[PDB]
Amino acid sequence: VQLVESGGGLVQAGGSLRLSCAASGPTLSNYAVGWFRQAPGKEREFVAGINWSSGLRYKDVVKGRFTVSRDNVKDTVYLQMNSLKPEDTAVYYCAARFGGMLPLQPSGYANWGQGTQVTVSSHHHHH
Amino acid sequence: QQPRPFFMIFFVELWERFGYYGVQGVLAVFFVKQLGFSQEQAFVTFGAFAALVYGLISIGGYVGDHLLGTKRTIVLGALVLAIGYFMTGMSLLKPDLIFIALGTIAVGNGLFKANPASLLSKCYPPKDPRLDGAFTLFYMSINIGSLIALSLAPVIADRFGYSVTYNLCGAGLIIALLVYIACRGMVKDIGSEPDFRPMSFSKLLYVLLGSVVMIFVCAWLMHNVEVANLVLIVLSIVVTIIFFRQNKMFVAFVLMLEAVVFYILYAQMPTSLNFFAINNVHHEILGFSINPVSFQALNPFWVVLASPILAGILSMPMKFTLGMFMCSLGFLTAAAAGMWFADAQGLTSPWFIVLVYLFQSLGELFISALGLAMIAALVMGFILGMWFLTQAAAFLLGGYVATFTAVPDNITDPLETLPVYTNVFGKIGLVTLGVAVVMLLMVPWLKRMIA
Ligand SMILES: CCCCCCCCCCCCO[C@@H]1O[C@H](CO)[C@@H](O[C@H]2O[C@H](CO)[C@@H](O)[C@H](O)[C@H]2O)[C@H](O)[C@H]1O
Ligand SMILES: CCCCCCCCCCCC
Ligand SMILES: CCCCCCCCCC
Ligand SMILES: CCCCCCCC
Ligand SMILES: CCCCCC
């Protein structure tokens, strides 16, 4: 009913991060968990999600870079973010909806984490 | 307002129905999520379970009337039911148990359903005016128990697990049993004839032996729906022949086919309409979030409100016709909500599902109750048998019909499921509309035959 997100932070372009979503009261197993993100000055947008029976959904611009997965023993949902780019900078939220559907808009989800800041710097090492 | 044993019977019935609907509200989801069934396997297996629960109801009236007595059979049925609920809770340790546990519930329901109503009938002198109100309150008792179970059981299973839900079903039966035993003194001169002779252990052993055989046969049929299908197909065609060889009964035949259509539609509430609420409806109403499985509770809800009103407010065949039009409108409303009133993300307002369930409950209030009296007024044991066989078949047919809405586990987009639900619900509504029209056309001829 309340999700706790962890694992955000600051990373350089081409790096990786893992977000995790854990629920308090109810067991997350009955829930599709969607990851949303809100960049400065824009709306929350669907990023990626996993339904209650291992179906997956992705936004176009993160396919081949992000992987959603679920650890059904530890009751946790993960977002593995590789090949990170500056334009992935945002507050990331997990959201939970009962069942097999992952709707694209925030209004499809009742339960929300508080959000974790992810920042991707164009920093690269000096040549 | 009513005799004192009425309140005992009221609360025993309430708690027994709470146990039953605590299971019914969560069963299809339990099949999918806990046992890993596909939605199609879950729907046909729920159909088989419901067919057995319904068809075995014929046994309990005989056992109570002629073998052990009404009061003894209330006690025995409550015990077998409670055992079934705890076995279902135990099936989480031993998954191999599940079908046996469900068979134990079916047989337990079979032994118990007809007996409290029978007992209530004996609490009133034969032409007492308060009878009608007492039985309307009896139905309301059933639906308060169902309303509580369908509301809370999905919530309990989400927060604490199925073992807890099923054990609480068992506990509800235990307190039904405690309320009966604590109140046994109120019904000492109420009963069928065997209640007042000492109990025959021969007949009790026959009843327990037959119960166990049936628990195993039910388990098998539910595990192999492909033989439940042919058993009921050949049994149905055969009993149709044996009805045809042997003119007030033809009214029962056409009304039985119409009842079959009604039960096919009623069977959708825990299956296709349940998963429709899960997949394509907003899980928020009046600002409160809810478990969409709890939406099944809208059926007893509307009955609880509407049964008094409609008691305050043609005759038999027209009441059947009205119920059938109401049901048709429930499914056309479901279809319409999906076709025209959905979100860009594929989700529809739950007020549409509130309306679907209102239409469906009004149909229930016109047909199911009214039909038993019509059966009791046009007619014996053979027609009860053919009735129960065919309506059980109707629940199997309902599970099969529901499979046309089954969603693969990898689908996640509501805009893919929305048109499947709308196509099936719309076609159901159109066929039921046709059925309601032919019913209307025959209403006058039917109404002549009842004279
Ligand atoms: C239409 C019939 C409605 C049935 C009414 C439900 C009875 C009330 C539930 C007991 C009290 C409320 O207790 C709690 O409330 C929260 C938030 O309010 C609801 O919501 C929470 O649980 C359910 C699953 O159980 C999830 O689908 C939901 O998204 C989640 O947020 C649940 O319903 C219940 O977990
Ligand atoms: C009220 C009398 C109690 C009767 C309990 C008898 C149980 C018989 C056991 C048969 C074993 C199969
Ligand atoms: C290995 C699981 C086998 C389960 C059989 C359960 C039977 C329990 C009887 C009460
Ligand atoms: C009133 C006594 C009922 C006996 C039923 C018990 C059968 C095992
Ligand atoms: C009475 C209807 C039987 C249908 C079998 C497909």
Side-chain angles (χ1 to χ4, degrees):
Chain A
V1 54
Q2 224 175 325
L3 324 174
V4 298
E5 299 127 328
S6 87
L10 170 72
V11 73
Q12 70 175 295
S16 298
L17 287 161
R18 170 172 275 219
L19 307 175
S20 79
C21 187
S24 49
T27 206
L28 256 189
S29 211
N30 298 315
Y31 295 79
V33 179
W35 292 93
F36 287 77
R37 76 183 178 186
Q38 199 177 18
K42 320 213 291 190
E43 331 293 1
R44 275 171 224 220
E45 59 177 30
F46 183 86
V47 181
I50 188 174
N51 77 358
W52 66 352
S53 59
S54 303
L56 306 164
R57 196 184 188 158
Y58 288 103
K59 195 203 207 342
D60 35 31
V61 297
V62 302
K63 303 198 191 165
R65 311 162 48 226
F66 291 14
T67 300
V68 185
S69 67
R70 183 206 285 277
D71 183 12
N72 267 314
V73 283
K74 259 165 97 141
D75 225 332
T76 312
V77 169
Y78 302 103
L79 184 62
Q80 176 67 41
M81 275 161 313
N82 301 331
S83 304
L84 280 167
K85 316 180 160 181
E87 53 267 24
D88 299 318
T89 293
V91 184
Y92 284 69
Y93 303 87
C94 64
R97 151 186 195 91
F98 191 101
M101 282 318 96
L102 290 156
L104 285 188
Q105 296 304 325
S107 57
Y109 303 74
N111 289 337
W112 286 85
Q114 296 279 17
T116 322
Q117 183 74 54
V118 162
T119 304
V120 184
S121 181
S122 62
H123 173 268
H124 52 99
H125 300 291
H126 186 58
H127 305 89
Chain B
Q1 40 171 313
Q2 308 282 345
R4 279 251 153 200
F6 163 98
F7 299 97
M8 184 227 92
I9 286 155
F10 188 93
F11 281 86
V12 169
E13 187 63 20
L14 198 154
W15 286 104
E16 187 274 330
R17 292 287 84 193
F18 163 84
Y20 175 73
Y21 282 103
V23 166
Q24 160 162 319
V26 308
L27 191 57
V29 167
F30 174 84
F31 285 157
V32 168
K33 278 300 284 157
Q34 189 65 36
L35 309 194
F37 287 19
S38 67
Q39 277 177 27
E40 142 183 36
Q41 305 173 257
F43 289 166
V44 297
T45 308
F46 185 90
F49 174 67
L52 296 163
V53 159
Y54 187 89
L56 285 183
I57 285 162
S58 45
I59 297 331
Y62 173 64
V63 173
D65 282 343
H66 301 99
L67 303 189
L68 304 181
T70 306
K71 301 191 282 181
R72 295 206 181 94
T73 306
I74 283 171
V75 176
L76 178 69
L79 287 159
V80 174
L81 279 172
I83 288 179
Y85 296 130
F86 295 121
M87 275 161 86
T88 310
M90 247 194 290
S91 282
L92 284 101
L93 301 146
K94 296 54 180 60
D96 265 31
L97 193 60
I98 179 62
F99 290 129
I100 287 290
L102 296 174
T104 302
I105 294 163
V107 168
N109 177 73
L111 288 157
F112 182 99
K113 179 53 54 245
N115 282 293
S118 176
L119 199 67
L120 177 72
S121 156
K122 279 150 199 179
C123 289
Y124 300 79
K127 58 193 166 216
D128 190 308
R130 310 172 283 179
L131 258 181
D132 280 6
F135 270 83
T136 310
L137 294 153
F138 183 74
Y139 207 55
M140 293 177 34
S141 175
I142 292 172
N143 285 263
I144 286 155
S146 175
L147 164 61
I148 293 162
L150 292 176
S151 288
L152 298 192
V155 176
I156 294 293
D158 188 41
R159 277 173 202 300
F160 307 105
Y162 289 110
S163 204
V164 166
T165 307
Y166 297 151
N167 287 343
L168 284 172
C169 291
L173 266 291
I174 294 291
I175 94 164
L177 203 289
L178 293 171
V179 155
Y180 173 86
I181 278 182
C183 299
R184 222 185 153 234
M186 299 186 205
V187 290
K188 272 309 145 292
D189 299 347
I190 316 297
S192 61
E193 182 181 344
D195 267 311
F196 299 106
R197 297 173 292 161
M199 183 183 15
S200 151
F201 282 85
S202 178
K203 278 145 186 242
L204 173 55
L205 292 167
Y206 285 122
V207 170
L208 299 181
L209 270 48
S211 291
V212 167
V213 169
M214 275 324 282
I215 288 172
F216 277 88
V217 170
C218 283
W220 190 67
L221 288 173
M222 275 174 64
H223 188 283
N224 310 104
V225 175
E226 181 38 303
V227 316
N229 287 344
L230 304 144
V231 161
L232 254 62
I233 272 165
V234 303
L235 250 58
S236 281
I237 65 83
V238 153
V239 167
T240 283
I241 283 317
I242 87 164
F243 174 85
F244 276 7
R245 281 190 181 185
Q246 311 256 348
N247 290 337
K248 291 220 220 190
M249 302 324 78
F250 296 98
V251 173
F253 187 69
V254 56
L255 293 166
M256 89 180 33
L257 230 55
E258 311 172 342
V260 158
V261 164
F262 168 81
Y263 279 117
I264 290 178
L265 298 215
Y266 197 85
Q268 304 310 301
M269 296 192 295
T271 53
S272 67
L273 283 173
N274 183 27
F275 273 63
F276 173 69
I278 292 175
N279 287 336
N280 284 99
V281 176
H282 283 284
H283 300 346
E284 195 178 87
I285 189 170
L286 298 176
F288 318 81
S289 314
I290 66 138
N291 191 316
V293 183
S294 295
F295 280 122
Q296 295 168 77
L298 286 165
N299 162 246
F301 175 83
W302 279 125
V303 175
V304 164
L305 302 177
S307 31
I309 287 198
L310 263 275
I313 313 316
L314 322 203
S315 295
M316 239 69 96
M318 180 58 21
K319 280 168 170 160
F320 256 76
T321 302
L322 280 183
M324 192 79 30
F325 276 107
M326 297 315 265
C327 291
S328 183
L329 287 174
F331 282 84
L332 293 167
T333 295
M339 272 165 98
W340 302 313
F341 296 99
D343 257 356
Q345 62 189 323
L347 295 177
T348 192
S349 167
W351 292 108
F352 287 107
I353 205 77
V354 173
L355 184 66
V356 168
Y357 271 87
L358 174 53
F359 276 131
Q360 187 64 212
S361 298
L362 289 166
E364 178 185 333
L365 282 174
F366 284 109
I367 297 183
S368 61
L370 276 315
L372 295 174
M374 167 114 75
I375 282 314
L378 306 148
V379 175
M380 182 43 176
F382 159 73
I383 75 100
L384 284 321
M386 191 194 194
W387 166 266
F388 287 116
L389 178 61
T390 55
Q391 308 342 114
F395 280 95
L396 219 42
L397 269 169
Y400 171 61
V401 161
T403 67
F404 292 102
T405 70
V407 181
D409 307 347
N410 70 298
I411 302 301
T412 61
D413 179 7
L415 291 167
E416 278 199 70
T417 63
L418 196 52
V420 176
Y421 289 114
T422 59
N423 189 52
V424 176
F425 291 159
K427 286 183 186 161
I428 292 170
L430 291 168
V431 174
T432 296
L433 187 60
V435 166
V437 163
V438 187
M439 271 155 91
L440 176 60
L441 290 172
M442 296 180 174
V443 163
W445 182 358
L446 211 168
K447 188 152 63 140
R448 256 141 58 200
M449 298 279 240
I450 298 188

mmCIF file of all heavy atoms in Angstrom, chain B residues 308-322:
data_model
loop_
_atom_site.group_PDB
_atom_site.id
_atom_site.type_symbol
_atom_site.label_atom_id
_atom_site.label_comp_id
_atom_site.label_asym_id
_atom_site.label_seq_id
_atom_site.Cartn_x
_atom_site.Cartn_y
_atom_site.Cartn_z
ATOM 1 N N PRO B 308 -36.206 -5.795 -0.082
ATOM 2 C CA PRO B 308 -37.338 -5.113 0.590
ATOM 3 C C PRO B 308 -38.215 -4.303 -0.361
ATOM 4 O O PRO B 308 -39.440 -4.517 -0.417
ATOM 5 C CB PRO B 308 -36.649 -4.213 1.634
ATOM 6 C CG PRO B 308 -35.287 -4.739 1.791
ATOM 7 C CD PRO B 308 -34.911 -5.382 0.490
ATOM 8 N N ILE B 309 -37.613 -3.409 -1.151
ATOM 9 C CA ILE B 309 -38.393 -2.568 -2.055
ATOM 10 C C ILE B 309 -39.296 -3.425 -2.932
ATOM 11 O O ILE B 309 -40.515 -3.229 -2.978
ATOM 12 C CB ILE B 309 -37.462 -1.683 -2.901
ATOM 13 C CG1 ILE B 309 -36.877 -0.576 -2.031
ATOM 14 C CG2 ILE B 309 -38.214 -1.130 -4.116
ATOM 15 C CD1 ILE B 309 -36.319 0.554 -2.795
ATOM 16 N N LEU B 310 -38.715 -4.427 -3.597
ATOM 17 C CA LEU B 310 -39.500 -5.269 -4.495
ATOM 18 C C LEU B 310 -40.501 -6.159 -3.760
ATOM 19 O O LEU B 310 -41.496 -6.566 -4.365
ATOM 20 C CB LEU B 310 -38.563 -6.133 -5.343
ATOM 21 C CG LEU B 310 -38.233 -5.598 -6.742
ATOM 22 C CD1 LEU B 310 -39.295 -5.984 -7.756
ATOM 23 C CD2 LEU B 310 -38.046 -4.082 -6.715
ATOM 24 N N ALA B 311 -40.282 -6.445 -2.471
ATOM 25 C CA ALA B 311 -41.321 -7.093 -1.672
ATOM 26 C C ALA B 311 -42.508 -6.162 -1.449
ATOM 27 O O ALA B 311 -43.666 -6.599 -1.493
ATOM 28 C CB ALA B 311 -40.751 -7.559 -0.332
ATOM 29 N N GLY B 312 -42.230 -4.875 -1.210
ATOM 30 C CA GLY B 312 -43.298 -3.893 -1.094
ATOM 31 C C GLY B 312 -44.112 -3.760 -2.367
ATOM 32 O O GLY B 312 -45.339 -3.662 -2.326
ATOM 33 N N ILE B 313 -43.447 -3.783 -3.515
ATOM 34 C CA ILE B 313 -44.126 -3.595 -4.785
ATOM 35 C C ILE B 313 -44.882 -4.868 -5.156
ATOM 36 O O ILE B 313 -45.420 -5.558 -4.284
ATOM 37 C CB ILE B 313 -43.118 -3.224 -5.901
ATOM 38 C CG1 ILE B 313 -42.141 -2.121 -5.463
ATOM 39 C CG2 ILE B 313 -43.842 -2.772 -7.127
ATOM 40 C CD1 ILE B 313 -42.770 -0.943 -4.706
ATOM 41 N N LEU B 314 -49.094 -11.010 -16.783
ATOM 42 C CA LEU B 314 -47.990 -10.921 -15.810
ATOM 43 C C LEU B 314 -47.770 -12.176 -14.911
ATOM 44 O O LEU B 314 -47.678 -13.298 -15.446
ATOM 45 C CB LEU B 314 -48.119 -9.640 -14.976
ATOM 46 C CG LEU B 314 -48.621 -8.395 -15.753
ATOM 47 C CD1 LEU B 314 -48.191 -7.124 -15.047
ATOM 48 C CD2 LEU B 314 -48.148 -8.304 -17.237
ATOM 49 N N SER B 315 -47.652 -11.984 -13.589
ATOM 50 C CA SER B 315 -47.507 -13.090 -12.621
ATOM 51 C C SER B 315 -46.266 -13.865 -13.057
ATOM 52 O O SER B 315 -45.205 -13.250 -13.230
ATOM 53 C CB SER B 315 -48.782 -13.915 -12.543
ATOM 54 O OG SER B 315 -49.870 -13.174 -12.019
ATOM 55 N N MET B 316 -46.331 -15.182 -13.257
ATOM 56 C CA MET B 316 -45.093 -15.961 -13.316
ATOM 57 C C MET B 316 -44.323 -15.741 -14.611
ATOM 58 O O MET B 316 -43.163 -15.294 -14.551
ATOM 59 C CB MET B 316 -45.393 -17.439 -13.049
ATOM 60 C CG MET B 316 -44.641 -18.003 -11.830
ATOM 61 S SD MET B 316 -45.237 -17.330 -10.278
ATOM 62 C CE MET B 316 -46.396 -18.605 -9.790
ATOM 63 N N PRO B 317 -44.858 -16.064 -15.796
ATOM 64 C CA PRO B 317 -44.007 -16.001 -17.002
ATOM 65 C C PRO B 317 -43.504 -14.602 -17.323
ATOM 66 O O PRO B 317 -42.429 -14.423 -17.927
ATOM 67 C CB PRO B 317 -44.944 -16.509 -18.115
ATOM 68 C CG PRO B 317 -46.118 -17.079 -17.450
ATOM 69 C CD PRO B 317 -46.248 -16.385 -16.121
ATOM 70 N N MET B 318 -44.252 -13.578 -16.925
ATOM 71 C CA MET B 318 -43.821 -12.213 -17.198
ATOM 72 C C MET B 318 -42.672 -11.822 -16.281
ATOM 73 O O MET B 318 -41.755 -11.129 -16.712
ATOM 74 C CB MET B 318 -44.993 -11.251 -17.048
ATOM 75 C CG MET B 318 -44.698 -9.781 -17.313
ATOM 76 S SD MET B 318 -44.023 -9.215 -18.903
ATOM 77 C CE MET B 318 -44.423 -10.495 -20.073
ATOM 78 N N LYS B 319 -42.694 -12.287 -15.029
ATOM 79 C CA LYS B 319 -41.589 -12.051 -14.110
ATOM 80 C C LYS B 319 -40.289 -12.664 -14.631
ATOM 81 O O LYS B 319 -39.218 -12.043 -14.557
ATOM 82 C CB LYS B 319 -41.922 -12.648 -12.753
ATOM 83 C CG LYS B 319 -42.842 -11.760 -11.937
ATOM 84 C CD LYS B 319 -43.380 -12.466 -10.756
ATOM 85 C CE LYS B 319 -44.092 -11.550 -9.801
ATOM 86 N NZ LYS B 319 -45.004 -12.323 -8.931
ATOM 87 N N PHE B 320 -40.362 -13.889 -15.160
ATOM 88 C CA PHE B 320 -39.215 -14.495 -15.833
ATOM 89 C C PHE B 320 -38.750 -13.652 -17.013
ATOM 90 O O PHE B 320 -37.540 -13.436 -17.206
ATOM 91 C CB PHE B 320 -39.563 -15.889 -16.335
ATOM 92 C CG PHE B 320 -38.998 -16.982 -15.516
ATOM 93 C CD1 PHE B 320 -39.563 -17.290 -14.296
ATOM 94 C CD2 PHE B 320 -37.925 -17.720 -15.964
ATOM 95 C CE1 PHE B 320 -39.073 -18.319 -13.530
ATOM 96 C CE2 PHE B 320 -37.421 -18.748 -15.206
ATOM 97 C CZ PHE B 320 -37.994 -19.054 -13.982
ATOM 98 N N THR B 321 -39.698 -13.198 -17.839
ATOM 99 C CA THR B 321 -39.339 -12.358 -18.981
ATOM 100 C C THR B 321 -38.617 -11.075 -18.527
ATOM 101 O O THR B 321 -37.604 -10.674 -19.113
ATOM 102 C CB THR B 321 -40.603 -12.080 -19.799
ATOM 103 O OG1 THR B 321 -41.129 -13.342 -20.199
ATOM 104 C CG2 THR B 321 -40.303 -11.296 -21.055
ATOM 105 N N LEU B 322 -39.153 -10.398 -17.508
ATOM 106 C CA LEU B 322 -38.512 -9.195 -16.988
ATOM 107 C C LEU B 322 -37.094 -9.475 -16.502
ATOM 108 O O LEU B 322 -36.167 -8.697 -16.781
ATOM 109 C CB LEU B 322 -39.328 -8.589 -15.850
ATOM 110 C CG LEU B 322 -40.537 -7.734 -16.171
ATOM 111 C CD1 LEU B 322 -41.102 -7.218 -14.865
ATOM 112 C CD2 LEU B 322 -40.138 -6.590 -17.077
#
